[PDB]
Ligand binder design. Structure first.
Ligand code: ZJP
Ligand code: ZN
Length: 197
């Protein structure tokens, strides 16, 4: 009881820059400053962009702003708060059944717009700033046009699947692999986010 520890906050440690012609990852905080920010929940760094790279003490993954909510996966964040300039921010959405959590989008973030195109030609954005073409195959599944080892997708849960026009279609949740090769991905459809809201 006296020694009861508390888990740290999720910390923004970088972002995927989709501003220009070339997508690229940027780190905005090193491990040590991430360690201290997770403990205090106090993050003074300027936030920019739609796709953040986030980290706990033991995991790193992505988080994506859609309609004023920073979304990510429950299997990464659990019920953790996120660090912010004035302290830990409690989740405003939690759904273990969808593998989904959300906090209010940070000041300075930009939000993606929910897709209403009805298109099945999608693009998955990874933590290494790869933009991977994906054909939608169902409400929550898409196939990679070019399969690759799951190693290349590890750490990209919470990232977005986008339509051709750059709208958010879903949040990357899991990889479907055969012999360690990712042939398809499962994602939380944006409609399921909009219902949660
Ligand atoms: C605890 O409470 C909950 C509640 C609901 C939950 N719901 C799901 C689906 C779930 O799955 C866990 C976590 C998830 C995952 O690894 N996600 C990725 C990632 O990158 N994570 S991560 O960022 O590195 C990190 C771990 C740091 C956060 C994108 C993957 C990239 C590579 C995967 C390689 C090896 C894993 C293949 C596996 N495949 C699979 O399960 O496929 C089946 C499900 C649908 C199709 C069939 C898979 O993908 N996952 C296993 N845990 C849950 C836990
Ligand atoms: Zn669209």
């Amino acid at each position: 009881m006296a020694s009861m520890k508390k888990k740290g906050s999720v910390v923004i440690v970088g972002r995927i820059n989709l501003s220009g012609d070339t997508a690229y990852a940027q780190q905005t905080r090193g491990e040590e400053g991430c360690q201290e920010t997770s403990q205090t929940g106090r993050d003074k760094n300027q936030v920019e962009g739609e796709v953040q790279i986030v980290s706990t003490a033991t995991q790193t993954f992505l988080a994506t702003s859609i309609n004023g909510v920073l979304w990510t996966v429950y299997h990464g964040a659990g019920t953790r708060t996120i660090a912010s300039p004035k302290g830990p921010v409690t989740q405003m959405y939690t759904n273990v059944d969808k593998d989904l959590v959300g906090w209010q989008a940070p000041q300075g973030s930009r939000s993606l717009t929910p897709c209403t195109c009805g298109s099945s030609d999608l693009y998955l954005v990874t933590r290494h700033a790869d933009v991977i073409p994906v054909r939608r195959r169902g409400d929550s599944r898409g196939s990679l046009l070019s399969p690759r080892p799951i190693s290349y997708l590890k750490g990209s849960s919470g990232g977005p699947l986008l339509c051709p026009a750059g709208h958010a279609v879903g949040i990357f949740r899991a990889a479907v692999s055969t012999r360690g090769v990712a042939k398809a991905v499962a994602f939380i459809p944006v409609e399921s986010l909009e219902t949660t809201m």
